[PDB]
Amino acid sequence: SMPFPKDCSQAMLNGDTTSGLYTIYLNGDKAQALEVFCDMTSDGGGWIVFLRRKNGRENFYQNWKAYAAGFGDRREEFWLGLDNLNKITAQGQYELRVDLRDHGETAFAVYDKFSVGDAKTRYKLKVEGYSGTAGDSMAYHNGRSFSTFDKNCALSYKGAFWYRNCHRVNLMGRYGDNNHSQGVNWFHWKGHEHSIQFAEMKLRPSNFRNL
Ligand SMILES: Cc1nc(CN2CCC(CN)CC2)cs1
């Protein structure tokens, strides 16, 4: 086992094949512990989950400081934090996976390259190299800074995201809200008048597939 695994891929290879809460260590530093939910089952596992929507119990209409730090219950609905995502994605080349489920239908998107810049970039999104069944709805968002109501699409749609003008992905939108562009949307799968029941965003090293 690795003593200070830097992501859920290093924590998995530690043999641990059950999804749930694990400690990772940013940059392998024992003083930078972070509790994360590891999805150890989806497409070979090793995924740090950083967003989960499943029941509408948690409020995602939150401010910059909340999006920077993270909020919620890692075992249920939560947001890991942009500062965490920046520090994880700085460690190497990561891939993004998005898992969606709504009334029994499932879809996914993988982006071979995923990074989140630091606070001086307003946590700029990079997403490249799409494959999947959900449809490439993140391309629209590529290179955009993060937006909250206090730093306007966030205000106008009551969510938070790497907004442009405004969105094709709104996974931090209002749960069960089928009003145009208000809900948990992935436009190229279910459009803007269909709020998705279940959504996860997760990351792991892009080289995991052949390590
Ligand atoms: C007493 C505290 N509550 C939190 C909330 N959230 C931040 C940790 C995690 C994101 N990195 C999701 C949950 C942090 S410290």
Coordinates of N, CA, C and O and ligand atoms in Angstrom, one line a residue, residues 34-35 69-74 78-81 84, ligand 1:
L34 N -7.2 14.9 3.0 CA -8.5 15.3 2.5 C -9.4 14.0 2.5 O -8.9 13.0 1.9
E35 N -10.6 14.0 3.1 CA -11.5 12.9 3.1 C -12.2 13.0 1.7 O -12.8 14.0 1.5
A69 N -14.3 26.1 -1.1 CA -14.0 25.3 0.1 C -14.6 23.9 0.0 O -14.0 23.0 0.5
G70 N -15.8 23.8 -0.6 CA -16.6 22.6 -0.6 C -17.7 22.6 0.5 O -17.5 23.4 1.4
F71 N -18.7 21.8 0.3 CA -19.9 21.8 1.2 C -20.6 20.4 1.0 O -20.4 19.8 -0.1
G72 N -21.4 20.1 1.9 CA -22.2 18.9 1.8 C -21.7 17.7 2.5 O -20.8 17.7 3.3
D73 N -22.4 16.6 2.4 CA -22.2 15.3 3.0 C -21.6 14.4 1.8 O -22.3 14.2 0.9
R74 N -20.3 14.1 2.0 CA -19.6 13.3 0.9 C -20.3 12.0 0.6 O -20.2 11.5 -0.5
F78 N -23.0 16.6 -2.3 CA -21.9 17.5 -1.9 C -21.2 18.0 -3.2 O -21.4 17.5 -4.3
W79 N -20.3 19.0 -2.9 CA -19.4 19.6 -3.8 C -18.0 19.6 -3.1 O -17.9 20.1 -2.0
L80 N -17.0 19.0 -3.7 CA -15.7 18.8 -3.1 C -14.9 20.1 -2.8 O -14.1 20.2 -1.9
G81 N -15.1 21.1 -3.6 CA -14.4 22.4 -3.5 C -13.4 22.6 -4.6 O -12.7 21.7 -5.0
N84 N -9.6 22.3 -3.7 CA -9.3 20.9 -3.7 C -9.1 20.4 -5.2 O -8.1 19.7 -5.5
Ligands
LIG1 C1 -17.0 21.3 9.4 C2 -16.8 21.3 8.0 N1 -17.7 21.1 7.1 C3 -17.1 21.1 5.8 C4 -18.0 20.9 4.6 N2 -17.6 20.4 3.2 C5 -16.2 20.7 2.9 C6 -15.5 19.4 3.0 C7 -15.9 18.7 1.7 C8 -15.3 19.5 0.5 N3 -13.8 19.5 0.7 C9 -17.5 18.6 1.5 C10 -18.1 18.9 2.9 C11 -15.8 21.3 5.8 S1 -15.2 21.6 7.3

